[PDB]
């Protein structure tokens, strides 16, 4: 009940996503597919990797998480952290990534691409 695949889950690195990857072996792009206050879960390399902390500046986000809203502009009240081109933000009790450039992909893999990036 509002925990499984939400706030909880297996894995939760304490160190940085870079320290995560190079530790285990894969050095692939970390595509954050799920964001929470208790950390995030990335689809990187081949698998899903879960950890707690902040998204690094050059991390990759899932297109499912990015914020394209016709009424919403990036508010510092919702900004939790900033990444390259986008902002990992918590608005309306939910987490998004505000992409300033949704056209050329400012760190965005589509759900389709994510599965290609995991190959």
Q: Which is nearer to Zn ion, 41 or 89 (CB)?
A: 41
Q: Which is nearer to Zn ion, 26 or 102 (CB)?
A: 26
Task: Provide the minimum distance between the beta carbon of 21 and Zn ion in the complex, in angstroms, as a whole number.
Answer: 6
Task: Provide the minimum distance between the beta carbon of 33 and Zn ion in the complex, in angstroms, as a whole number.
Answer: 13
Residues of span 42-61 touching Zn ion by CB under 5 A? 49
Number of residues that bind Zn ion (CB under 5 A): 1
Residue nearest to Zn ion (CB): 49
Q: Which is nearer to Zn ion, 42 or 107 (CB)?
A: 42
Contact (CB, 8 A) for 24 and 7: no
Task: Provide the minimum distance between the beta carbon of 70 and Zn ion in the complex, in angstroms, as a whole number.
Answer: 35
Closest CA to 18 of 7, 9, 27, 8: 27
**CA–CA distance, 116 with 79 (Å, rounded to integer):** 30
Beta strands in the chain (DSSP E): 31-36, 39-44, 47-51, 60-62, 66-67, 79-82, 86-91, 94-99, 108-109
Contact (CB, 8 A) for 71 and 78: no
Q: Which is nearer to Zn ion, 49 or 66 (CB)?
A: 49
Which chain residues interact with Zn ion by CB under 5 A? 49
């Amino acid at each position: 009940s509002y925990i499984d695949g939400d706030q909880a889950g297996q894995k939760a690195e304490n160190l940085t996503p870079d320290e995560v990857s190079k530790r285990e072996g894969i050095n692939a792009e970390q595509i954050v597919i799920k964001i929470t206050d208790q950390g995030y879960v990335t689809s990187h390399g081949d698998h899903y990797h879960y950890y707690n902390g902040k998204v690094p500046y050059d991390a990759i986000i899932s297109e499912e998480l990015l914020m394209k809203d016709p009424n919403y502009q990036l508010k510092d009240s919702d900004i939790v952290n900033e990444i390259k081109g986008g902002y990992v933000i918590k608005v309306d009790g939910k987490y998004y990534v505000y992409l300033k450039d949704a056209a050329h992909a400012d760190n965005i893999r589509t759900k389709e691409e994510i599965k290609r990036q995991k190959q």
